[PDB]
C-alpha cells in the first residue's frame, strides 16, 4: 500500500541503475591524453576599436552574417546596429520597453529581435524601404521574463524565459509551435547546433538539457555544477559544449561519451562566470568573468593562455565571428570593445 | 579617401547626436522604484498616482514634474538575477500592510524580504522608504488579538501608540549599514495631498543628500 513512496524511490533506483553506469566505461581521463600536446603561447592582443555610443549597460550582443555588423542593446530602450570596420552606427532603434535582457540577429541578415522584462519578444525589420525602422511582430507567451532568444531562420525563433520552460515560435503565423515543459529551475541561456537540429538550454538547477527541435521532447539532462548556470555556448563540430557557472568553474560537457570532461578553476578570484565563447577551431575558450576580466582558457591544457584588460564594470557578453577574426567584449560602462 | 564616407559619417553623427539628445531627456528626470508584498498595499497608494503581463510603468506628474513608478510584483520569478538591472534609481518604495499579522507568518515574511533589500550589494546607496497602510483598520485589531501572539521576546501595552511604534521600531533596526541610507516611514491617510507630499519632500532630501554626495559635504 501507498506506492507513491515507491514511485519516488524508483527515481533513485533508475538513477543508480542508469546514470551510475559510468564506472567501466568512463575511464579515459584528460591527463594521459593531454600530456603530449603543444600550447598556443602567450596571446598578446589589444583593443582595435572602442564603440563609445551607448549611455547604459550592455549585456546583449550578436554578430551579423558576413562577420561585419554588430547588434547591441542598452538600458534606455535603444538598439544600435554597429559596424566593425569604420566604427560606424547604422540603425538606432527606439523601443517600447526600457530593460532589455537579450538580442539576436538573423542568419540571413534581414530581421532582428529583442526582449526583456515586459514578456514581449519584439521582432523588427531592417530591410524596410518605408520607414526603415518599424515593428514587424511582438510575440508574447511567457509570464516571467525573457532571458535569451536565438534565430533558426527568417520564419522561426527559439525563445526561453524564467517560467522554467522554452518555446519555438513562428513568424509566419504569430502563434507558438511547441512548448518544452519539464524543467525545474529558471532557464538562463541557450545555444544551438550550427546545423540547427539540437539546442542546449541553461538552468538555475545546475543542469544543461540537450533538447530536440522537431519531435518536441527532451533528450539529455546533465549535472556537475554546484551553483547557477549563466552562459552556454556550443562547440563548432557538435560533440561538446561549455557551461559557465557562479563558482568560478567553467565545465566542458560531452554528448557522444556522455561524461563531463574538463573543469576550469580560477584559484585567484572566485567570482562568477557570466559569459562563455568558443573560437573557430577550438583550443581557445574565451570566458568573461565578474572580476573585471576576460580570460583565455585552453580546451585541453586548462591553463590560462593570457588575459585581457577590463573595464569600469564587469564584462557581460562575449562574441567570436563566423571566421574567427574578431573578439567583441561588452561591459556595463557602455564601452563595447573589439579586440584582436 | 572618403568616396561616400563623407555621407556615411553624416548618418553616423546624426543618430549619434539623437542618442545624446534622447538620453539627456531620460537622464534628467527622476525615477522612483516600488517593491512591496503579495497584494498588500500597492493598489491603494497608486489611486492618486494614475496618469499625467510583465512590469508596467506609471507616469504621473506633480508640481510640473514627471515621476516614473516601476512595479515589481508582476514578475512571477526569482529576484537574484534581475534586481541589479533596477539600480540607479533614486528612491525605493517598500509598501507594507499592517492587518496581515494574523494570517499565515505574513508579517514575518516581509521582514526577511525587507532584510534582503537593505543589505543588497547593488543597493548600498539608494535610500529606501516604507509605507504602513491600513491606519484606521489597524486601530480595531488590538482589542480582539494583540501584537504579542508570536512574540515571547517582547512585552508591551495594548495601546494604539505602542502597537504602531513597535512595528516602525522593528523594521528600522534591520539594516546592517546605517551610514549611507536612511529609512523613511510615513503612516498613510485617506486624503489626497498629504499622502504623497511627504514622499515629495522625501525625494527632495535624497537629492539634497545626493548634492552633499557631489560637493563632498557629507
Amino acid at each position: 500500500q501507498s506506492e507513491l513512496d515507491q514511485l519516488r524511490q524508483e527515481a533513485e533506483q533508475l538513477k543508480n541503475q542508469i546514470r551510475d553506469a559510468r564506472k567501466a566505461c568512463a575511464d579515459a581521463t584528460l591527463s594521459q591524453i593531454t600530456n603530449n600536446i603543444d600550447p598556443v603561447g602567450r596571446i598578446q592582443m589589444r583593443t582595435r576599436r572602442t564603440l563609445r555610443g551607448h549611455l547604459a549597460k550592455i549585456y546583449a550582443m550578436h554578430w551579423g552574417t558576413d562577420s561585419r555588423l554588430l547588434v547591441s542593446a542598452s538600458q534606455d530602450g535603444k538598439l544600435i546596429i554597429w559596424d566593425s570596420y569604420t566604427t560606424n552606427k547604422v540603425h538606432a532603434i527606439p523601443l517600447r520597453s526600457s530593460w532589455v535582457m537579450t538580442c539576436a540577429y538573423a542568419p540571413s541578415g534581414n530581421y532582428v529581435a529583442c526582449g526583456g522584462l515586459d514578456n514581449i519578444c519584439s521582432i523588427y525589420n531592417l530591410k524596410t524601404r518605408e520607414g526603415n525602422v518599424r515593428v514587424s511582430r511582438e510575440l508574447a507567451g511567457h509570464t516571467g521574463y525573457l532571458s535569451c532568444c536565438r534565430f533558426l531562420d527568417d520564419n522561426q525563433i527559439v525563445t526561453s524565459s524564467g517560467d522554467t520552460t522554452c518555446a519555438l515560435w513562428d513568424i509566419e503565423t504569430g502563434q507558438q509551435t511547441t512548448t518544452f515543459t519539464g524543467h525545474t529551475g529558471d532557464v538562463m541561456s541557450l545555444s544551438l547546433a550550427p546545423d540547427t537540429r539540437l539546442f542546449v538550454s541553461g538552468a538555475c538547477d545546475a543542469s544543461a538539457k540537450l533538447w530536440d527541435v522537431r519531435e518536441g521532447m527532451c533528450r539529455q539532462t546533465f549535472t556537475g555544477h554546484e551553483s547557477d548556470i549563466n552562459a552556454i555556448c556550443f562547440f563548432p563540430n557538435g560533440n561538446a559544449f561549455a557551461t559557465g557557472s557562479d563558482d568560478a568553474t567553467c565545465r566542458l560537457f560531452d554528448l557522444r561519451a556522455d561524461q563531463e570532461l574538463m573543469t576550469y578553476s580560477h584559484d585567484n578570484i572566485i567570482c562568477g562566470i557570466t559569459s562563455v565563447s568558443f573560437s573557430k577551431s577550438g583550443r581557445l575558450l574565451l570566458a568573461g568573468y565578474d572580476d573585471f576580466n576576460c580570460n583565455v582558457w585552453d580546451a585541453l591544457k586548462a591553463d590560462r593562455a593570457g588575459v585581457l584588460a577590463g573595464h569600469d564594470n564587469r564584462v557581460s557578453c562575449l562574441g567570436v565571428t563566423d571566421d574567427g577574426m574578431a573578439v567583441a567584449t561588452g561591459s556595463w560602462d557602455s564601452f563595447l570593445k573589439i579586440w584582436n | 579617401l572618403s568616396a561616400e564616407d563623407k555621407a556615411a559619417v553624416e548618418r553616423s553623427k546624426m543618430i549619434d547626436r539623437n542618442l545624446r539628445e534622447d538620453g539627456e531627456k531620460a537622464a534628467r528626470e527622476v525615477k522612483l522604484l516600488l517593491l512591496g508584498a503579495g497584494e498588500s498595499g500597492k493598489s491603494t497608494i497608486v489611486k492618486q498616482m494614475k496618469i499625467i503581463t510583465g512590469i508596467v510603468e506609471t507616469h504621473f506628474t506633480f508640481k510640473d514634474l514627471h515621476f516614473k513608478m516601476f512595479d515589481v510584483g508582476g514578475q512571477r520569478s526569482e529576484r537574484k538575477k534581475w534586481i541589479h538591472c533596477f539600480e540607479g534609481v533614486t528612491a525605493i518604495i517598500f509598501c507594507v500592510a499592517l492587518s496581515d499579522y494574523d494570517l499565515v507568518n505574513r508579517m514575518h515574511e516581509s521582514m526577511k524580504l525587507f532584510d534582503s533589500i537593505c543589505n543588497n550589494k547593488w543597493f548600498t546607496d539608494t535610500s529606501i522608504i516604507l509605507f504602513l497602510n491600513k491606519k484606521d483598520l489597524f486601530e480595531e485589531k488590538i482589542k480582539k488579538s494583540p501584537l504579542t501572539i508570536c512574540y515571547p521576546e517582547y512585552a508591551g501595552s495594548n495601546t494604539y501608540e505602542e502597537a504602531a511604534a513597535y512595528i516602525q521600531c522593528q523594521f528600522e533596526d534591520l539594516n546592517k549599514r546605517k551610514d549611507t541610507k536612511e529609512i523613511y516611514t510615513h503612516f498613510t491617510c485617506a486624503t489626497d495631498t498629504k499622502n504623497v507630499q511627504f514622499v515629495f519632500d522625501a525625494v527632495t532630501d535624497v537629492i539634497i543628500k545626493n548634492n552633499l554626495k557631489d560637493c563632498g559635504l557629507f
Epitope: 547604422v90 | 561616400e4 556615411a8 553624416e10 548618418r11 553623427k13
Partner: single-chain antibody
C-alpha cells in the same frame, strides 16, 4: 505604395526665376538625402544638386553653381528648388530623387515624376553603341568602360545600372556593380574588375526594353555617357 507629388508650369523666357516643389508620402522624408536629376530631350542624363539629411552638405556640379538654391522642409515633407537667371540651354525634364548612404543601402532606388521646363574636367565614360539587335532568348553585353580605376581597396565598386522604360520614369537595376535591387528579376547578372565591366542579360523577354544607363559614383559630380538602348530588329 509610396507617392511622390510634383507639379508643372509653362515655358519661361531666358532670364527668369522660379521655384519647384517635390512632396513625398509613404516613408520618412527626413532620413533621405535628395538629388535633382535633369534629363535633356536628347536622352542624356545629367545632375544638378544634392542636399543631405542633416542640412549640412550641399553639392552641385561644375556648370551648375551660383545661380541655383536648394532647401527642404521636413515637417511639411517638401523639397524646394529656387532657380535664378534661366537660359535656353538649361531647361529640360526634372526629377526629384531620394537616396540614402549606408552599408547595404540602395542609392537612386526609386525616382519620381518631376517637372517639364521648356523654352521658345569630369571623369570620361564610354557608352557605345546604342543599337543592338535582341530576340526573346538572345544575350547582350553592354559596353561601359571607365578611365579612372574604381579599385579603392574598400572594396566597393561604385557603378550603377539603370533601366528607362518608354513612357514612365527610369528605375534602378544594379547597385554597387554586383548586387540586385528590390523588385528586379535575377536576369541582370553583372560583374567586372577594376576597369572592365560586363552586364550579362540571359533568357531575355520582350517586356523590359528601354535605355540602359551606367553611372559612375566615386567622385562628384555624377558622370554619365550617351545612352544604350536595344531594338527588336
Amino acid at each position: 505604395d509610396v507617392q511622390l507629388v510634383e507639379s508643372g508650369g509653362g515655358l519661361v523666357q531666358p532670364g527668369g526665376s522660379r521655384k519647384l516643389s517635390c512632396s513625398a508620402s509613404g516613408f520618412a522624408f527626413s532620413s533621405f538625402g535628395m538629388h535633382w536629376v535633369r534629363q535633356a530631350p536628347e536622352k542624356g542624363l545629367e545632375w544638378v544638386a544634392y542636399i543631405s539629411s542633416g542640412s549640412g552638405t550641399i553639392y552641385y556640379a561644375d556648370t551648375v553653381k551660383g545661380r541655383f538654391t536648394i532647401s527642404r522642409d521636413d515637417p511639411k515633407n517638401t523639397l524646394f528648388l529656387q532657380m535664378t537667371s534661366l537660359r535656353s540651354e538649361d531647361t529640360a525634364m526634372y526629377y526629384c530623387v531620394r537616396s540614402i548612404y549606408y552599408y547595404g543601402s540602395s542609392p537612386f532606388d526609386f525616382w519620381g515624376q518631376g517637372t517639364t521646363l521648356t523654352v521658345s574636367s569630369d571623369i570620361v565614360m564610354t557608352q557605345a553603341t546604342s543599337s543592338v539587335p535582341v530576340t526573346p532568348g538572345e544575350s547582350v553585353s553592354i559596353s561601359c568602360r571607365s578611365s579612372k580605376s574604381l579599385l579603392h581597396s574598400n572594396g566597393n565598386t561604385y557603378l550603377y545600372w539603370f533601366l528607362q522604360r518608354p513612357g514612365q520614369s527610369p528605375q534602378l537595376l544594379i547597385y554597387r556593380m554586383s548586387n540586385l535591387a528590390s523588385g528586379v528579376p535575377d536576369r541582370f547578372s553583372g560583374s567586372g574588375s577594376g576597369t572592365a565591366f560586363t552586364l550579362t542579360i540571359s533568357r531575355l523577354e520582350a517586356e523590359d526594353v528601354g535605355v540602359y544607363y551606367c553611372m559612375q559614383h566615386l567622385e562628384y559630380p555624377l558622370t554619365f555617357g550617351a545612352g544604350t538602348k536595344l531594338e527588336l530588329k
